[PDB]
């Protein structure tokens, strides 16, 4: 997706600023708009009947979210979109967007569509891998592999002993579907194992 | 996408018949081809290390499979594409697709990409749900849910007791992500609980 296509698409979008820890939408909310992350980071979370959460991923600038309704006929969202930092999001209704595809943005339709396909593909892969790990790996193995993915993210701040990640016991718990305490227990085992050390929301992964 | 866009798309594809139980491609194989299911039923399976499989879904006529490499430049496949029945699949290389997307197929590009988008979105939603289930629901619980999903499968052959759903113990375990054995333990416990009959290769779910 080139700079022109992006700017042309954003001209018809509505830019809004969001504080951190803010749910942009939750399961059941009207599904009529598409969001484009201009700045900041957000997370997509699956919710359960007992209010238990499964974090599916983190998304930054250039990512389209709340896009499902643009492809699947539905009056409601199926997940929670939450801000992890202060955010700026551009939004545009599905109707308006598709209208633009038949006219104004007619030329960029293929590019915007392909780009959304790129993200959906990445997401399907990661989610496909999260499903596999949830079915065949113990919590310790899910946590180690998760700490290693997190350290591959551009957000991974370097450290003299390896990579300095930024995760809390709660989020870790949310990422691998285990209790907060279990995540806390696994962290002290890995530290005792010499694979890393932790401090509040700072995990220093060795490597 | 219309039948007109579909036919032109196939005009450049190589249709090949596949026997049932044939893994069209496994993780590791080259990924320079896209597949379009013309007829038949296939399954997308993911593998782990302990040599375990998790069915992520079944797909019929009209489905684009093996499409990942068309979006995420990769040299290899990440999943197993396995025919569940005899199938007719039309394949086309990625390279020749986008070259076509810039030539006689440029006008079809929008509808093609969007259709693939629709399919990617359904699988994402379905897999997202699976992960959620594999995280918070128990085996027996997941198996019951999956038994009902198949009852609504066009295959579901109605029965005087309920519905006759042909699903091997192996596939059940691959569906809910449990050992072929454990899956058995629950099929018998459900054959006791009075709600289904574990008939060798088939399952008669009482009720629905």
From Swiss-Prot, chain A:
It comes from the Bacteria. GO terms for molecular function: catalytic activity; cyclic-di-GMP binding; DNA binding; DNA-binding transcription factor activity; protein dimerization activity. Changing residue 145 to A: Almost no change in DNA-binding, but decrease in c-di-GMP-binding. One of its GO terms (biological process) is regulation of DNA-templated transcription. Changing residue 144 to A: Decrease in DNA-binding. Disruption phenotype: Mutant produces less EPS and shows decrease in cellulase and protease activities. Allosterically inhibited by cyclic di-GMP (c-di-GMP), which binds to Clp and abolishes its ability to bind its target gene promoter. Residues 137-207 form the HTH crp-type domain. One of its GO terms (cellular component) is cytosol. Residues 169-188 bind DNA. Changing residue 174 to A: Decrease in DNA-binding. Homodimer. NCBIfam families: PRK11753.1 (NF008732). Binding of c-di-GMP appears to trigger the active Clp conformation into an open form or inactive state, hence abolishing its DNA-binding ability. This is CRP-like protein Clp. It comes from Xanthomonas campestris pv. campestris (strain ATCC 33913 / DSM 3586 / NCPPB 528 / LMG 568 / P 25).
């Amino acid at each position: 997706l080139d700079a022109g296509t992006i700017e042309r698409f954003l001209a018809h979008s509505h830019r809004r600023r969001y504080p951190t820890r803010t749910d942009v939408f939750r399961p059941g909310d009207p599904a009529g708009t598409l969001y484009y992350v201009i700045s900041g980071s957000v997370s997509i979370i699956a919710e359960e009947d007992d209010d238990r959460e499964l974090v599916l991923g983190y998304f930054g600038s250039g990512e389209f979210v709340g896009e499902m309704g643009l492809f699947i006929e539905s009056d409601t969202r199926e997940v929670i979109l939450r801000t992890r930092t202060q955010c700026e999001l551009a939004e545009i209704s599905y109707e308006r967007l598709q209208q633009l595809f038949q006219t104004s943005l007619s030329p960029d339709a293929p590019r915007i569509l392909y780009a959304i396909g790129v993200q959906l593909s990445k997401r399907l892969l990661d989610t496909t891998r999260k499903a596999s790990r949830l079915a065949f790996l113990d919590v310790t193995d899910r946590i180690v592999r998760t700490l290693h993915d997190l350290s591959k993210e551009p957000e991974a701040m370097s450290h003299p002993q390896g990579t300095q990640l930024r995760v809390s016991r709660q989020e870790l718990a949310r990422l691998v579907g285990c209790s907060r305490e279990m995540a806390g227990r696994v962290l002290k085992k890995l530290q005792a194992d010499g694979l890393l050390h932790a401090r509040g929301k700072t995990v220093v992964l060795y490597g």
